Design a protein around this ligand. Structure first.
Ligand SMILES: NC(=[NH2+])NCCC[C@H](N)C(=O)O
Ligand SMILES: NC(=[NH2+])NCCC[C@H](N)C(=O)O
Ligand SMILES: NC(=[NH2+])NCCC[C@H](N)C(=O)O
Ligand SMILES: [Cl-]
Ligand SMILES: [Cl-]
Ligand SMILES: [Cl-]
Ligand SMILES: [Cl-]
Ligand SMILES: [Cl-]
Ligand SMILES: [Cl-]
Ligand SMILES: [Cl-]
Ligand SMILES: [Cl-]
Ligand code: NA
Length: 129
């Protein structure tokens, strides 16, 4: 599913992501924009052989099982395919664990490089929330 901007903001809010770990809703929407272009089915292979999955490009190296990332962990206790659903619940639940891991949203390098320090409220501007 390719979400609209405001549509994804609403879905993230209902799942409790807004201000989660102190990160306002626009941070999460900005991260999703640059990670996946709001597409739940996004996948991207990393040069180490892990893969990033879903709207927030969660990495199989640590967070989900895809069966082909040797040595990796599955800290969200889910198949990586669950992160590709139209329903964002699994991605949100796992993102909550990632952002709680010590480095905040810097775990998403695209957030650090493209969202951190910017006017992230622009990503929810105009949305009926
Ligand atoms: N509990 C964990 N294993 N977290 C991930 C550890 C490494 C982390 N992805 C890093 O490069 O900054
Ligand atoms: N650390 C991340 N945010 N990884 C997800 C993708 C971001 C990175 N610029 C890439 O596409 O390779
Ligand atoms: N229609 C929107 N509000 N899009 C997101 C805002 C974009 C933001 N101003 C930026 O600098 O990229
Ligand atoms: Cl917020
Ligand atoms: Cl915001
Ligand atoms: Cl881009
Ligand atoms: Cl594996
Ligand atoms: Cl949803
Ligand atoms: Cl889900
Ligand atoms: Cl933080
Ligand atoms: Cl920040
Ligand atoms: Na894994």
């Amino acid at each position: 599913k390719v979400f609209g901007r405001c549509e994804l903001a609403a879905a993230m809010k209902r799942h409790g992501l807004d201000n989660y770990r102190g990160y306002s809703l626009g941070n999460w929407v900005c991260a999703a924009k640059f990670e996946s272009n709001f597409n739940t089915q996004a996948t991207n292979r990393n040069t180490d052989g892990s893969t990033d999955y879903g709207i927030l490009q969660i990495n199989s190296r640590w967070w989900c099982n895809d069966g082909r990332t040797p040595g990796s962990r599955n800290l969200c206790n889910i198949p990586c395919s669950a992160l590709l659903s139209s329903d964002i619940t699994a991605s949100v639940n796992c993102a909550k664990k990632i952002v709680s891991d010590g480095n905040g949203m810097n775990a998403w390098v695209a957030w650090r490089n493209r969202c951190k320090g910017t006017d992230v409220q622009a990503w929810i501007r105009g949305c009926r929330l």
